[PDB]
Structure 1
Amino acid sequence: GDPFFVADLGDIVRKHETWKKCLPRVTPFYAVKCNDDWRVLGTLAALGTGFDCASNTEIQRVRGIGVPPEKIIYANPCKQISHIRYARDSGVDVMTFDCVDELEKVAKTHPKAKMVLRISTVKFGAKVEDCRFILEQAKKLNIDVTGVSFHVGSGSTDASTFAQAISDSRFVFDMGTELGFNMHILDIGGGFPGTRDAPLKFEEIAGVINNALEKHFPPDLKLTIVAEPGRYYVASAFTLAVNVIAKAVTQSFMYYVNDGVYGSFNCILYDHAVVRPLPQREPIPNEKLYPSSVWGPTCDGLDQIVERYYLPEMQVGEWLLFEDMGAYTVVGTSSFNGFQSPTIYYV
């Protein structure tokens, strides 16, 4: 009675149809770090997306499935020197950076790279006020700076963050052109919601992006607008089924399932994730709900998935389901306590 994922790949197809409708000017480069499953990456490749890779291993994974290097962006601003050499031999030329020290590595290791200055919206992002000096030094290093990127992140309450980021990008775009650079790529990053229970919808985020785009980056055959969505594509696609392996009573209950914070639910710690346990059995009308906690299978007392969510009395052998579990779930798991990661089945 092991745990398992059900990934509906048709959900990915619908997400992309909605992307083309809402953001027709923006070519999506899927952030593979989000979910690097083969059937996910094949479905996206077939739908025609690019791919945002952050390491030599992710480049190897997408190149292995026949994706050409021009559909890959190496969007890690701080790259190990060996990793840059590897990308250069795979034909991947587009890479990000956010400081001059990164350009010193690139001038030694991959001088013909098309470099995209990532700006801040504190780990990553060159402050706008440092950007002039960065680009001046790039000219001294003979770097082909070809664009600007930013990343708003998933924690956007107000869509106005996208608008200001795009306005700031235009200011850096114009600086680049003033210094003789071939500025032709805007990369608007990720952070787009992938779930139906999101407060800031995708549809209004897109409206704010498109109005800012028409203002600051009016249509032009020279300009290519690009993005780096991760969770948007895969979040609602995966559903996790977990077996209740133990039970305890105190009214309240305590359920232990065979997957937790070391496995698929590492999203709780690493990705600010909140989840909702759903009984897989048909709900009987008017059955009472008690306040209940759910726990992973490890020793650790930190291995808790839910604190007090109102569930009906369950039994050992029954299953709980977690919807919206495809983003940053099958990628951050470990083999702690010796427990195995759930097998993925596809619809």
Structure 2
Amino acid sequence: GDPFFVADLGDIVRKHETWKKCLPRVTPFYAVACNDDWRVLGTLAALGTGFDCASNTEIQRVRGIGVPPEKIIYANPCKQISHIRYARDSGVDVMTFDCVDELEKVAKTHPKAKMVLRISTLSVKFGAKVEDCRFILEQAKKLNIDVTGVSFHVGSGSTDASTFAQAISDSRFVFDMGTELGFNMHILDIGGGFPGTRDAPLKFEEIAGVINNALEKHFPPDLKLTIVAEPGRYYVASAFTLAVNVIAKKVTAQSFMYYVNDGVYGSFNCILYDHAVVRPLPQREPIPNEKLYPSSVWGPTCDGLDQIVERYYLPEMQVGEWLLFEDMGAYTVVGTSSFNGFQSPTIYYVVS
């Protein structure tokens, strides 16, 4: 009994209907790094989404399924010059940047690229400060760069939706400096970070209302403007369910330790890289009266820090039963390794 995933592609279809309802002005460019499974990319492409690609490999994968290059944005600010050459030769023209050094590379390798300036909000890693953006655009003008718009990324779990309003207002300032220096600014890219479980505390529908009101104030509708986003976990987090076998058991007031055949080097790498919190669900239906015991649950590797859950209340379980983990579609399969020889879970697909 090897661990496996169930991927419900009909869940991705409903997320797409809700996006179009709450953000009808915004075309979504799915962040392929979140989950690059071939059926998930093929469902999203059948639905008419764009793709955000971050490397020569992702660009290769989305063309492979038929997607034309105009439905790709190459949204990595700091690109190896040979991956930029690969983008140009596949026909991908829209890329991001956030400093003058990157524009130097682009001038030598992809002179006609349509370039989008990312502003900070997110990171020390990426994002130009609004007070540096005049100097950057003056240098872009000297390098004959076709700057076409502005982008930002708030980050994947805020308690306020007000960060989106402030980023939109800052984006209009930087957008007007563009126009004043003579660039054709016509793209606003409001990035990613929307919740992918309909039971998050800060709901998708309130974030969207905040965004629509800031858009209406600072970017009124106009046929020369396109608004885009880069959602990843919003489309896929709740579509995948993981099942894992209990392969070993320890008993110690009573306490239990369960060992399962997937862990922090495999699918639960999201615990360390994505700060995920996960909840184990016995696959057996809750049966009357049941006693519940303090339990920890561990991955299969040699590593003492391969631990998935430290204290959760479970019934008493037996070797060979199954534990389920819901909402396991985002940043999970993509960061897996084969540490200690363990293999990653096969994926099986349903259509709701």
Give the TM-score normalised by structure 1: 0.99
How far apart are the structure 2 equivalents of 1:144 and 1:196?
A: 39
Question: Alpha-carbon deviation of 1:96?
Answer: 0.2
How far apart are the structure 2 equivalents of 1:267 and 1:197?
A: 19
**Partner secondary structure for residue 182 of structure 1:** coil
The CA RMSD over aligned residues, in Å, is 0.5
Note the alpha carbon deviations across 1:52-75, whole angstroms, 9 max, x for none.
000000000000100000000000
Question: Alpha-carbon deviation of 1:212?
Answer: 0.4
**Partner secondary structure for residue 246 of structure 1:** strand
How far apart are the structure 1 equivalents of 2:304 and 2:160?
A: 36
How far apart are the structure 1 equivalents of 2:224 and 2:255?
A: 63
Give the gaps of 5 or more residues in structure 1: none
How far apart are the structure 1 equivalents of 2:198 and 2:242?
A: 17
Note the alpha carbon deviations across 1:166-197, whole angstroms, 9 max, x for none.
00100100000000000000000000000133
Q: Any residues of structure 2 matched to 1:297-316 within 5 Å, and which? A: 297-316=300-319
Question: Alpha-carbon deviation of 1:252?
Answer: 1.1
How far apart are the structure 2 equivalents of 1:196 and 1:182?
A: 38
Out of 332, 339, 344, which is 1:341 matched to?
A: 344
How far apart are the structure 2 equivalents of 1:105 and 1:84?
A: 9
Question: Alpha-carbon deviation of 1:285?
Answer: 1.9
**Partner secondary structure for residue 168 of structure 2:** helix
How far apart are the structure 2 equivalents of 1:200 and 1:176?
A: 34
Question: Alpha-carbon deviation of 1:110?
Answer: 0.1
How far apart are the structure 2 equivalents of 1:74 and 1:113?
A: 10
How far apart are the structure 1 equivalents of 2:305 and 2:77?
A: 33
**2:237 equivalent in structure 1:** 235
Out of 235, 246, 258, which is 1:244 matched to?
A: 246
Give the gaps of 5 or more residues in structure 2: none
Question: Alpha-carbon deviation of 1:155?
Answer: 2.5
How far apart are the structure 2 equivalents of 1:285 and 1:80?
A: 60
Note the alpha carbon deviations across 1:17-59, whole angstroms, 9 max, x for none.
0000000000000000000000000000000000000000000
Query: Alignment length, in residue pairs?
Result: 346
How far apart are the structure 2 equivalents of 1:256 and 1:243?
A: 8
**Partner secondary structure for residue 59 of structure 2:** helix
Question: Alpha-carbon deviation of 1:220?
Answer: 0.5
Q: Is the 8 A contact 2:157 2:195 kept in 1?
A: no
How far apart are the structure 1 equivalents of 2:99 and 2:276?
A: 31
Question: Alpha-carbon deviation of 1:249?
Answer: 1.0
How far apart are the structure 2 equivalents of 1:338 and 1:235?
A: 27
Q: Is the 8 A contact 2:292 2:313 kept in 1?
A: yes
How far apart are the structure 1 equivalents of 2:315 and 2:275?
A: 26
How far apart are the structure 1 equivalents of 2:73 and 2:106?
A: 15
Q: Is the 8 A contact 2:157 2:194 kept in 1?
A: no
**1:82 equivalent in structure 2:** 82
Question: Alpha-carbon deviation of 1:116?
Answer: 0.2
How far apart are the structure 1 equivalents of 2:16 and 2:29?
A: 11
How far apart are the structure 1 equivalents of 2:100 and 2:157?
A: 29
**Partner secondary structure for residue 117 of structure 2:** strand
How far apart are the structure 1 equivalents of 2:86 and 2:288?
A: 60
Q: Is the 8 A contact 2:198 2:204 kept in 1?
A: no
**1:58 equivalent in structure 2:** 58
Question: Alpha-carbon deviation of 1:199?
Answer: 1.1
Question: Alpha-carbon deviation of 1:315?
Answer: 0.5
Out of 217, 220, 223, which is 1:218 matched to?
A: 220
Question: Alpha-carbon deviation of 1:157?
Answer: 0.9
**Partner secondary structure for residue 85 of structure 2:** helix
Question: Alpha-carbon deviation of 1:286?
Answer: 1.6
Question: Alpha-carbon deviation of 1:139?
Answer: 0.3
Question: Alpha-carbon deviation of 1:103?
Answer: 0.2
Task: Name which of structure 1's ranges 246-255 and 331-340 shifts more when overlaid on structure 2.
Answer: 246-255
Note the alpha carbon deviations across 1:131-174, whole angstroms, 9 max, x for none.
11001100000000000000001131100010101001001000
How far apart are the structure 2 equivalents of 1:329 and 1:230?
A: 12
**Partner secondary structure for residue 146 of structure 1:** strand
How far apart are the structure 1 equivalents of 2:326 and 2:311?
A: 18
**Partner secondary structure for residue 57 of structure 2:** helix
Q: Is the 8 A contact 2:53 2:75 kept in 1?
A: yes
How far apart are the structure 1 equivalents of 2:320 and 2:172?
A: 57
Note the alpha carbon deviations across 1:250-308, whole angstroms, 9 max, x for none.
12110000000000000000101000000011110220111111100000011011010
Note the alpha carbon deviations across 1:66-117, whole angstroms, 9 max, x for none.
0000000000000000000000001100000010000000000000000000
How far apart are the structure 2 equivalents of 1:129 and 1:286?
A: 63
Give the TM-score normalised by structure 2: 0.98
Q: Any residues of structure 2 matched to 1:128-207 within 5 Å, and which? A: 128-207=130-209
**Partner secondary structure for residue 15 of structure 1:** helix
**Partner secondary structure for residue 262 of structure 1:** coil
Out of 250, 265, 290, which is 2:293 matched to?
A: 290
**Partner secondary structure for residue 331 of structure 1:** helix
How far apart are the structure 2 equivalents of 1:291 and 1:48?
A: 47
**Partner secondary structure for residue 82 of structure 1:** helix
How far apart are the structure 2 equivalents of 1:130 and 1:193?
A: 31
How far apart are the structure 2 equivalents of 1:94 and 1:14?
A: 28
Show structure 1 runs of 4+ deviating over 3 A: none
